[PDB]
Amino acid sequence: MNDNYQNNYVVGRGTVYFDRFQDGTNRKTGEMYFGNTPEFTINTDSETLDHYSSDHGMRVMDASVLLEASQGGTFTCDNINADNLALWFLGEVSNTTQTQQTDAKEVFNPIMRGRYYQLGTTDDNPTGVRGVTNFQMVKADASIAISVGSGDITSIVGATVVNPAGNYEIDLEAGRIYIEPDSTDLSGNVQIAVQYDVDAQKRTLVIGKSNMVYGALRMISDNPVGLNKNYYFPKVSIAPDGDYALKGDDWQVMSFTFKAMQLNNITQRVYID
Amino acid sequence: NDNYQNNYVVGRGTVYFDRFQDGTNRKTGEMYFGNTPEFTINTDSETLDHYSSDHGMRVMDASVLLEASQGGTFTCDNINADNLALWFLGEVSNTTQTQQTDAKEVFN
Amino acid sequence: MISDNPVGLNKNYYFPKVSIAPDGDYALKGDDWQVMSFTFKAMQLNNITQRVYID
């Protein structure tokens, strides 16, 4: 039996398969397919207690009972997209089309040169619009409470107008005006006001809410170097761990730590298939 | 659904920051730090676990997310007045030398 | 943030309210670049606005 045995080696490949339990309920509805996952590890907690024997050699162990078999693991994701971004930020993939305002106008409160202002501001679309056809600048003294209205497109309490050809850079697609660090007409405190419109277009945002991340986990293996074998966890809470680098010459990765739970008295801590 | 061209990126982006006045926000406009060699988004979460047990012993039944703690850190490749003001907890005092003649001092 | 990744798609990060403070040894000496570290933590600007937005 010995000296003629062969080891059932293994090299880890495949992909992890989490899926989202329905919000606030202990049930699953859908499936998710992670892409490339650089790392995938599993660990276990080993809480136990024993003082039930002793002799000439004081305090010799005689037993050990397991009180809490908190199994779990960690895995990383090289693939980045709306879904695992939502999981990492504890959120959802909001998607909608910008409403065609067509006469958007409001006043930037303070003056300042060499800075960027977002045209779209309202909660209809945080972080601003992603397209406009044009914008016109009209200004007046900042030291007076200058509101805005429908007919204020032409003028305000101060009827002065500006030539954006100079002193005003616009990423017209990104919806961000930029004041020149030096300008001729932007001197003296004036609450610059912008008329503008939108390029009504589809939009999608991940909203970093506080809802718990919750579901089940599979791994379907098909290792190209050894035996293939699938690991399943009926219940897991995949909280984010470590950090997410938005810089560096390395490929972006997001890490996840997950603790495995018992779905019911019927199921096991983990299923190894 | 065997395979799909998953998405990878390399982190190259510009960071903007605006200096609010007192209050919830008073947008002074977004300032451009310049090149940022590093930008990490940290995430921590205080949480507890509620328990039950089979004829064995403790098995966690529910977990509670006490309060989400998100954050991070970034670095800047350039040194200038705005970055110094944001780092040193103050403001930029541009002024004049107060020209005069025959200014005097004693150094005992 | 705007991420014009040279080998990947773009996404936009937006933190409505953050607290900025100095981070450790901002070194003006040594022949290294004048690197400075900025620590930031996020909180809800108002309970309507969520903690963070990633477009």
Contact check, Cβ <8 Å, A251/B10? yes
Please report, for residues A145, A206, B79, C13, C49, the alpha-carbon distance to residue C44 in angstroms, rounded to integers and kept in the order given.
Answer: 27, 15, 30, 15, 6
How many CB atoms are located within 10 Å of the residue A106 CB? Answer: 16
Q: Give the distance from residue C30's alpha carbon to the nearest chain B alpha carbon, in angstroms.
A: 15
Q: Does A35 touch chain C (CB under 8 A)?
A: no
End-to-end CA distance of chain A: 26
Q: Is A108 exposed, middle or buried (0-12, 13-18, 19+ CB in 10 A)?
A: buried
What span, in angstroms and rounded, lies between the C-alpha atoms of A258 and C5?
Answer: 29
Contact check, Cβ <8 Å, A81/B6? yes
Instruction: Nearest by CB to C54, from A205, A210, A252: name it.
Output: A205
Q: Does A70 touch chain B (CB under 8 A)?
A: yes
DSSP bridge partners of A41? A74
* A198: nearest Cα among A105, A93, A65: A105
Interface mutation target, options A190, A247, A258, A259, chain B, most CBs of B under 10 Å: A247
User: Do A220 and A17 contact (CB within 8 A), yes or no?
Assistant: yes
Tokens of A266: 């019927």
3-class DSSP state of A15 = coil
H-run or E-run covering A48 = strand A47-49
What span, in angstroms and rounded, lies between the C-alpha atoms of C19 and C36?
Answer: 16
What span, in angstroms and rounded, lies between the C-alpha atoms of A244 and B30?
Answer: 24
3-class DSSP state of B88 = helix
* A45: nearest Cα among A18, A61, A67, A65: A67
Angle (nearest 5°) at CA B11 between B9 and B16: 130
Pairing of strands A176-179, A116-118: antiparallel
CA dihedral A164, A107, A160, B94 (to 10 degrees): -80
DSSP of B2-63: --------B--EE-EEE---SSS-----EEE----SEEEEEEEEEEEEEEEE-SSSEEEEEE
Q: Is A244 exposed, middle or buried (0-12, 13-18, 19+ CB in 10 A)?
A: buried
3-class DSSP state of A82 = helix
* B45: nearest Cα among A8, A139, A243, A42: A243
Q: Does B63 touch chain A (CB under 8 A)?
A: yes
Please report, for residues B74, B91, B102, C1, C41, the alpha-carbon distance to residue C21 in angstroms, rounded to integers and kept in the order given.
Answer: 11, 14, 43, 19, 9
Task: For B54-98, list the strands marked E by DSSP.
Answer: 58-76
User: Do A272 and A251 contact (CB within 8 A), yes or no?
Assistant: no
3-class DSSP state of B81 = helix
Q: Is B42 exposed, middle or buried (0-12, 13-18, 19+ CB in 10 A)?
A: middle
Q: Give the distance from residue C45's alpha carbon to the nearest chain A alpha carbon, in angstroms.
A: 12
Residue type, A226: G
* Experimental resolution (Å): 4.2
For chain A, the chains sharing at least 3 beta-carbon pairs closer than 8 angstroms are B, C
* Structure-token match 């305000």, residue found: A156
Tokens of A209: 């809410």
Which three-class secondary structure string do you get for A197-245? CCCCCEEEEEECCCCCCCEEEEECCCCCCCCCCCEEEEEEEEEEEEEEE
3-class DSSP state of A44 = strand
Instruction: Nearest by CB to A127, from C3, C48, C55: name it.
Output: C55
DSSP bridge partners of B76? C36
